[PDB]
Structure formats: C-alpha cells, structure tokens
C-alpha cells in the first residue's frame, strides 16, 4: 500500500498521537510536575511536525498546499488550547474544579491528535492527486 519509507509527516503524526495517548493514560495519576513534561513533548513533536510539512508543501498542488497550511495554523491553535487547560490544570490541582481540567486536557489534546490524523490523510491524498497532475 503505502511506502513510510522516508515520511517523516507520517512519522510526526505518529509519534504526536502516541504523545497524546500516553497522556490519555497518565493524566490520572501523574503530578503537576509529571503533565507539564508530557504536554511539553506534545509542543516538541507538533513542531517537527509542522517542520517536515513545510518541507514537503513545495511540491504539492496549490488548492492541498493551502488547504494544509490552513491545518497547519489549526495544529497549533489545538496546541495553544492544549496549554490553556494545563494552566488551568494546574491552578485549581487543590480545588474540586481539578477532575474537569483533566477532562478538559483530555479533551484538548484528543481534537489536537484527531486533527494530525486527519492532516495524514490530506497529505497522503494530496501526493495522490500530485501524481495525477
């Protein structure tokens, strides 16, 4: 099928919804400290990320290459939300208002992985749609 070969957007993607899941699972029992780091990470792969899409956008056709550096303005905005919560997270850790910031990070950091995904996909096509061209 496809050839991952030398696709790092795909390798971004992964490694991004992998840091996602991994603090899908840890947020529970992870400590102020231990979140910061994670969502830190989540910073680091989005921005290889949007590095290795930049790279490959030269060589698509315009429609996909404006379309994607929309995705790409959106990835961060995803990322930007993500942070808010954290903040959030972190001033009501005391508060009974602490369990729904953690949904709320959940909630932020999944949209922001779905939309890498999706982002994959609009890649993958626009390579398709390259070849036709």
């Not at 099928?1 to 992964?14: A, P």
């Not at 603090?23 to 994670?38: C, F, I, R, T």
């Not at 903040?87 to 850790?93: C, F, P, S």
Request: proline share 3%; charged share 25%; net charge negative.
């Amino acid at each position: 099928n496809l050839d991952r070969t030398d696709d790092l957007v795909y390798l971004n993607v992964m490694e991004l919804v992998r840091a996602v899941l991994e603090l899908k699972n840890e947020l529970a029992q992870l400590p102020p400290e231990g979140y910061v780091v994670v969502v830190k990470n989540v910073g680091l792969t989005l921005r290889k990320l949007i590095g290795s899409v930049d790279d490959l956008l030269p060589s698509l056709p315009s429609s996909s290459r404006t379309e994607i550096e929309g995705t790409q303005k959106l990835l961060n905005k995803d990322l930007a939300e993500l942070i808010n919560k954290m903040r959030l997270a972190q001033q009501n850790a005391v508060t009974s208002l602490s369990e729904e910031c953690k949904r709320q990070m959940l909630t932020a950091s999944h949209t922001l992985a779905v939309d890498a995904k999706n982002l994959l996909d609009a890649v993958d096509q626009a390579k398709v749609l390259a070849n036709l061209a």
